[PDB]
From a paper:
Vesicle amine transport protein-1 (VAT-1) was originally isolated as a synaptic vesicle membrane protein, abundantly found in cholinergic synaptic vesicles, and suggested to be involved in vesicular transport. Although these investigations have suggested a variety of VAT-1 molecular functions in cell regulation, amino acid sequence analysis has indicated that VAT-1 belongs to the NAD(P)-dependent quinone oxidoreductase subfamily. With analysis of the crystal structures of free-form VAT-1 and NADP-bound VAT-1 complex and additional enzymatic studies, we revealed that VAT-1 contains a conserved NADPH binding cleft and binds NADPH to function as an oxidoreductase. VAT-1 comprises ten α-helices (α1–α10), five 310-helices (η1–η5) and sixteen β-strands (β1–β16), and forms two α/β domains, designated as Domain I and II.
We observed clear electron density for the bound NADP molecule. In the NADP-bound form, the nucleotide-binding tunnel is filled by the bound NADP molecule, which adopts an extended conformation and is almost completely buried inside. In the binding tunnel, VAT-1 forms fourteen direct hydrogen bonds with the bound NADP molecule. At one entrance of the tunnel, β9–α5 loop (Ser222), α5-helix (Lys225) and β10–α6 loop (Tyr240, His241) from Domain II form the phosphate-binding site and tightly trap the 2′-phosphate group of ADP moiety by forming six hydrogen bonds with the site, indicating the importance of the 2′-phosphate group of NADPH in VAT-1 binding. The nicotinamide ring forms three hydrogen bonds via the amide group of the nicotinamide with the main chains of β14–η5 loop (Phe326 and Leu328) and the N-terminal end of the Switch segment (Tyr285), whereas the ribose of the NMN moiety has no direct hydrogen bond. NADP binding induces conformational changes in the VAT-1 structure. The major conformational change is found in the Switch segment. On NADP binding, the Switch segment moves from α8-helix of the other protomer, which results in a shift of the protomer (by maximum of ~ 6 Å). We thought that the large empty space on the nicotinamide ring plane in our NADP-bound VAT-1 structure may be the substrate binding site for potential oxidoreductase activity.
Author numbering:
A (entry chain A): 46 to 388
B (entry chain B): 46 to 293, 300 to 389
The structure:
């Protein structure tokens, strides 16, 4: 009865994540802990960044990557009141989620709803927490606002478009490759823009010359400034990624140095004479703020049960094909969440 | 039968604002304009900064200062449908409000509700609009949050404390002189702090070690950084003044400008916001929705402007002293009077 795991031994291309096996030791959870078997795991942009050595919250090598999964608790430690063996939970953690068996703090798990599948549960947490906190806690989304959702056909992107639809009369500018544009219109993008073939600043200002109310900035680098200058009065640009660093399977020092030189900085007089806000969000730095993230997860489960959000699964891959899964995200082929299953 | 006005002749001390009179010509407002007679006018910190030559939005000298008033519409220009002669209105403008008769775009006026006096009306707009848009539009105040309200005994300060009370279970840290501390607690301040005699960062972090959720920064300069480092995760510091430039010794920290990078904000899970109401002219729909929400809160009895003192034009100097020498608690008002 062997257990399967993916391990990142070194930094580089796809081949640096390797499949391994381990003897199924008896489950022994500590105090306030849960050991559970994973049915599905999320592939995140942060996992690609960590594989290239550009995610600083990654523990030392070698390590099993992955920050979210969904499965069934097989053993419960002491002090855990709400969990019993056999409960289905989605887990958010710093690393170690690309493996069949994992042990995590009970307070970092969340009860999966009834009709929610393992795939949907594994797709919910990272993307929808990030989108909810970018648009509402920082963005303060309101009826009548305009939102620029970059990478709108991605995980965070599709989640943010759905959450925008939960707010009355919200105009959504979404950027993604032209092929995905049709999918974008199905998900709620009001104005699809292919930023690979056009200048999205110009397209937006041709539609809305005064700009937009919220700009979601996963691109980072120079793009941050573009977002800042697309803001209407009282607007907010929420920066939460550096996706311009990812160009290929291996880290490339040219994009690293270009973002290192073109960092966005703002001064108090700059913000004051404008009527704009700059916000930063990092879910990795929210661990230990379990009350906050838990309230967000409760809002998200409420929205799911009411049928206002439903994670879109692009593709599911076994561990043996983890490389291809990563390609699906790095070659910009995915529309929605990419998932891994333990073969 | 002449009409009175105050004029700013030069930049400097209190004596640089002089009283003048002019014959009362018949009101002739242009298209989309209103000419109205003012019963009360607001004294704002911006007026002091403009008198000292520190307000960038001030028209060239000489000019009548003042940015808010309340009065009676005496003549209506062409194209104005919602305003009629005799209407009681609050007016917001960039300058020219320290005078008996003034002409302004009709879209910069707001019908005063009854049971609101003219003095409360003249105290409402600048302070409560600024406080509302700092706490809600940028700050996104929610139940359970903690707010640091600097200058909590001033106009914006008291307005912001009242608006904080309109949200359930909001911890308010307020900074003002120790005397006004009692007034602070009467207005809704949970933890009065005298930043003249203690370090408000230390006091806050002794009460709440993780900091606060929203920091209202009228101080500017080095204090902005302090505010930024007082923020809990998802916190917001909304800077909306440079009150440290109106020092009136001088420390080495006084020269510290605030600057922040995208990765710093990202790593700290924080937000820095700037608000300047003067740069919102021409955004009448936004400010008008803010005024409507404020009038709603007033009708429900959740906000009531606190008037510190009312002064005639001839005593304008004393009025400015009341604010510049840190004596005021609430709004300072000017009336034409005798
Ligand atoms: N701060 C946080 O807490 C947090 C949390 C979650 C995610 N994030 C960030 O949110 C962004 C998206 O995350 P995600 O997980 O949902 O993945 P994702 O959106 O699916 O990213 C893949 C898609 O982004 C687009 N893309 C843009 N630039 C790309 C690049 N250099 N390489 C590959 N694809 C690129 C591609 O689609 P198109 O070309 O068609 O547009 C691609 O299909 C990422 O920057 C992530 O780092 C941050
Ligand atoms: N950006 C915008 O659109 C906008 C709009 C309105 C106001 N503002 C800004 O909000 C700030 C407060 O405006 P305000 O009209 O309500 O004035 P205020 O609050 O009445 O300020 C006076 C009070 O501030 C305190 N204070 C702090 N530093 C001071 C100093 N260096 N000199 C004198 N007094 C000082 C004094 O009381 P204590 O010492 O007891 O505290 C004094 O009682 C101002 O900086 C204003 O520029 C901005």
């Amino acid at each position: 009865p062997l257990l399967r795991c993916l391990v990142l031994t070194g930094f580089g291309g796809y081949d640096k994540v390797k499949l391994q096996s381990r003897p199924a030791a008896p489950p022994a959870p500590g105090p306030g802990q849960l050991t559970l078997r994973l049915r599905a795991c999320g592939l995140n942009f942060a996992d690609l960044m960590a594989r290239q050595g550009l995610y600083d919250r990654l523990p030392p090598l070698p390590v099993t990557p992955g920050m979210e999964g969904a499965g069934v608790v097989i053993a419960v430690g002491e002090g855990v009141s709400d969990r019993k063996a056999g409960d289905r939970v989605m887990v958010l953690n710093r690393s170690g989620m690309w493996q069949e068996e994992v042990t995590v703090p009970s307070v970092q798990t969340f009860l999966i709803p009834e009709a929610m599948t393992f795939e949907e549960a594994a797709a919910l947490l990272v993307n929808y927490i990030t989108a909810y906190m970018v648009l509402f806690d920082f963005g303060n989304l309101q009826p009548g606002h305009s939102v620029l959702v970059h990478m709108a056909a991605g995980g965070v992107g599709m989640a943010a478009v759905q959450l925008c639809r939960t707010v009355e009369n919200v105009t959504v500018f979404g950027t993604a490759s032209a092929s995905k544009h049709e999918a974008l219109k199905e998900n709620g993008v009001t104005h699809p823009i292919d930023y690979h073939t056009t200048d999205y600043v110009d397209e937006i200002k041709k539609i809305s010359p005064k700009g937009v109310d919220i700009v979601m900035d996963p691109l980072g680098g120079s793009d941050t400034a573009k977002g800042y200058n697309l803001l209407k009065p009282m607007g907010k640009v929420v920066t939460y990624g550096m996706a311009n660093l990812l160009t290929g399977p291996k880290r490339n020092l040219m994009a690293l140095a270009r973002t290192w030189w073109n960092q966005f900085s703002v001064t108090a007089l700059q913000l004051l004479q404008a009527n704009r806000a700059v916000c930063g969000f990092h879910l990795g730095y929210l661990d230990g703020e379990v009350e906050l993230v838990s309230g967000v997860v409760a809002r998200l489960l409420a929205l799911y049960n009411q049928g206002h959000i439903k994670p879109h699964i692009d593709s599911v891959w076994p561990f043996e094909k983890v490389a291809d899964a990563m390609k699906q995200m790095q070659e910009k082929k995915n529309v929605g969440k990419v998932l891994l299953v333990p073969g």
